[PDB]
Design brief:
part of a larger assembly; 3 chains; A mainly alpha (108); B alpha+beta (306); C alpha+beta (335); A: 108 residues; mainly alpha; two-stranded antiparallel sheet; C: alpha+beta; 2 domains; seven-stranded antiparallel sheet; three-stranded antiparallel sheet; globular; RNA-binding; hydrolase/rna; Csy; Cascade
RNA sequence: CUAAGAAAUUCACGGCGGGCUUGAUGUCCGCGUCUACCUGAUUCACUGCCGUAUAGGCAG
């Protein structure tokens, strides 16, 4: 998204009671919907808007510049199978390679 | 999924600028899915008219050159790029780092169908060769060998041998043809048993860590290197489901509005490069599709290997 | 309503191989199969500051301090050997069939309309002018680029390879055929007929294009320079790098394709340059300016939507430009 | 029906300033290499004569 709204990402990633606040707002807790809003309806719409950062927005779509690759079915068919970049998996592999190549134990 | 009645040897094919980035995690030799898709495109274009089916591809990879460079002061490498054309305002466009590789591979194709009895073997071999000489294999143009010394036609060898010794001699001659290369095979069993070995070594270890351990050079203190059974490359092993299979007209800006689209994630497995004389039969090296479309899992593998 | 397809992509027709560069002597061009290849070597340069100063470092003390620090680079250089005055540049060209057939198309109606538009183009005039200009750009060695600039004599031999033999051999004087005039010649018309039959066909037409340039003995040949990003690294790198395949200097295929596509003499700006490469929004990298802007009605996209959707068929020159883009290829389609 | 489809890196450059690597040196004791083999398979398509002959025959 934008490079200026990203502050609210830490507003969804703090550890106040000891857990991440997105999983706190995915449940209808007693401390939830009162700690951020005095009114009930404002709390409901703020919870819905704050939890909508996980759900995909817009129609399901892949652009023309994206990759789409036909796959032959066993009996008489194809699936179009647009791949997406696994940035979480790439970040995990890059973190593991960082520990492997520039970690303190690895350097020792 | 079936035993081939014949094996067609497409010879040394010089692919000019193949996609060196095989996967979001791996670079180098292209995906085996590219080779299986090329063989299915060959069957789609010229296979149906010859009344034959083309399923299963064995890759030999006689030569590989990567359009890469090593910058000074770093042990890693970078991809040499192409200058894209300027925008409409005369400025340089945003660069997408795409790597290229010059390949020289020869392909074993599994042929089954009644058309093998309807045409001469050299006729269907020459037809699929002249069809493949105007196609692409991993994003690169195929150099069709003009004005050199001695061009190489195919050699379609029928796998229904009259005798076991004649079949053995045919397979050894076909292996002798594709000699300066390495068969790339799938190693799901080896990767799974190495995952079990690491899980006995240390619990809650994922298949990603077992795949990584089979590629890095492990240094063990007394300082020796932990050995590997083979080359043990990390290959893209297929595509797993990331979304439900939407309707053909449902997905906006799809390639065609008649094929259903499903968003996928890359599947990573362990592949091995072997000298092709270390196989029982050359039909074991064939890379087959395996969809299983109810659960995603759009894989390519080498069934009937060992 | 005939909406445009949201993905619309075309294959690279006329896809060349990498232009292998070797060395030899003139009048030995017949036995050029054993010519030794041009090898890219490394050398060191010590230049001095000669770039523009921005009125803050123009004082004599700072300028003399900058000169006193020696400026050094390592450059990849390709030279001819000191007993070989001729550079031979050899590549293979595949004229692919189905030039107007897109690789991807969303709408079946738009695909039918585009195929009907291209079919009417072939029925009206064919690829005859476009293949004439492609045969021109093969006939003069524009793909030599800076190897063509100060050469004494350039000669291009083009061999049609049907199955395994030379079906037809064309020989052209590349200096006599200009870089900006597209005239008529009998051998050029035969090559145009072959390339247009390859574009109109179903398979492919294979050509071997060899260009001999009498640059001079031991002179500097100019292969394609590799685009390597420094990426802000701390260690200094080599400033100039070249391209080679296997100890053998080469030009990139996209540079040969750009020289082959330099046929566009119909852009609305004045043709002081002459032909430019066929690009969407007419981009020329050597100028930093893009002709055929979309604010005029002469860019490729608006011309295609006028020719296909609204049936506003443009002039014959702009139809040639549109079909030259289709032969060129590219990835199109609005979101 | 192929992480598909697409692409100009590039223009110019002074690396030379200068230099003692030296001395000194034990490689040395010891050794069973045997046995058994048809180059020859038409392996010399060779020499001369009649005939203008390259066409065709003859002699030992």
């Amino acid at each position: 998204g934008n490079a200026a709204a990203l502050d609210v990402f830490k507003f969804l990633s703090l550890q106040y009671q000891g857990k991440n606040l997105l999983n706190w707002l995915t449940e209808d807790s007693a401390e939830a919907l009162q700690a951020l809003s005095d009114n009930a309806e404002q709390a409901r719409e703020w919870r819905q808007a704050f939890i909508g950062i996980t759900t995909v927005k817009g129609a399901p779509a892949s652009h023309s510049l994206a990759k789409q690759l036909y796959f032959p079915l066993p009996g008489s068919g194809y699936h179009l199978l647009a791949p997406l970049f696994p940035t979480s998996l790439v970040h995990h592999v890059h973190a593991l390679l960082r520990e492997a190549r520039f970690g303190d134990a690895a350097k020792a | 999924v079936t035993d081939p009645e014949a094996l067609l040897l497409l010879p040394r094919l010089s692919i000019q600028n193949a996609n060196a980035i095989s996967s979001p995690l791996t670079w180098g030799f292209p995906s085996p899915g590219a080779f299986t898709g090329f063989v299915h495109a060959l069957q789609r274009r010229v296979g149906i008219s010859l009344d034959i089916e083309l399923d299963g591809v064995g890759i030999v990879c006689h030569r590989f050159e990567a359009q890469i460079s090593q910058p000074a002061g770093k042990r890693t490498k970078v991809f040499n790029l192409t200058r894209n054309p300027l925008n409409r305002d005369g400025s340089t466009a945003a660069i997408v780092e795409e790597g290229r590789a010059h390949l020289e591979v020869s392909l074993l194709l599994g042929v089954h169908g009644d058309g093998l009895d309807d045409h001469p073997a050299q006729e269907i071999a020459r037809q699929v060769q002249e069809q493949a000489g105007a196609m692409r294999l991993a994003g690169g143009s195929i150099l069709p060998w003009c004005n050199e010394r001695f061009p190489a036609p195919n050699a379609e060898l029928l796998m229904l041998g009259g005798s076991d010794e004649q079949r053995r001699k045919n397979q050894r001659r076909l292996t002798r043809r594709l000699l300066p290369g390495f068969a790339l095979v799938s190693r799901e069993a080896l990767l799974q048993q190495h995952l079990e070995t690491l899980r006995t070594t240390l619990p809650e270890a994922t298949t990603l860590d077992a795949l990584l351990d089979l590629c890095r050079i492990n240094f063990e203190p007394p300082w020796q290197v932990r050995d590997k059974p083979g080359w043990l490359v990390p290959i893209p092993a297929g595509y797993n489901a990331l979304s439900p299979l939407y309707l053909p007209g449902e997905v906006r800006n799809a390639r065609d509005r008649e094929t259903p689209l499903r968003f996928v994630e890359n599947l990573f497995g362990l592949g091995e490069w072997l000298s092709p004389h270390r196989v029982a039969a050359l039909s074991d090296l064939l890379w087959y599709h395996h969809a299983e479309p109810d659960k995603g899992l759009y894989r390519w593998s080498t069934p009937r290997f060992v | 309503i005939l909406s445009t397809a949201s993905v619309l992509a075309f294959e690279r027709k006329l896809d060349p191989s990498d232009a292998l560069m070797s060395a030899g002597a003139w009048a030995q061009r017949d036995a050029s199969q054993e010519w030794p290849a041009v090898t890219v070597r490394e050398k060191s340069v010590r230049g001095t500051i000669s770039n523009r100063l921005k009125t803050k470092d123009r004082d004599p003390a700072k300028l003399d301090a900058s000169i006193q620090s020696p400026n050094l680079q390592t450059v990849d250089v390709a030279n001819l050997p000191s007993d070989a005055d001729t550079l031979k540049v050899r590549f293979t060209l595949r004229v692919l069939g189905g030039a107007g057939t897109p690789s991807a198309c969303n709408d079946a109606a738009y695909r039918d309309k585009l195929l009907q538009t291209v079919a009417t183009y072939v029925n009206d005039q064919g690829f005859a002018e476009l293949a004439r200009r492609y045969a021109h750009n093969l006939a003069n060695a524009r793909f030599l680029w800076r190897n063509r600039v100060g050469a004494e004599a350039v000669e291009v031999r083009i061999n049609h390879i049907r199955q395994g033999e030379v079906a037809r051999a064309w020989r052209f004087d590349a200096l006599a055929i200009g870089l900006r005039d597209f005239k008529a010649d009998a051998e050029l018309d035969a090559l145009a007929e072959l390339i247009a039959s390859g574009l109109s066909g179903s398979g492919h037409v294979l050509l071997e294009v060899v260009a001999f340039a009498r640059i001079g003995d031991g002179q500097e040949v100019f292969p394609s320079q590799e685009l390597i990003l420094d990426k802000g690294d701390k260690k200094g790198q080599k400033s100039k790098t070249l391209y080679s395949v296997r100890d053998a200097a080469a030009i990139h295929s996209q540079k040969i394709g750009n020289a082959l596509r330099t046929i566009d003499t119909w852009y609305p700006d004045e043709d002081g340059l002459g032909p430019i490469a066929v690009e969407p929004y007419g981009s020329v990298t050597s100028q930093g300016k893009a002709y055929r802007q979309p604010k005029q009605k002469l860019d490729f996209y608006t011309l295609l939507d006028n020719w296909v959707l609204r049936d506003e068929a443009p002039a014959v020159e702009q139809q040639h430009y549109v079909i030259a883009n289709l032969i060129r290829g590219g990835v199109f389609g609005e979101a």
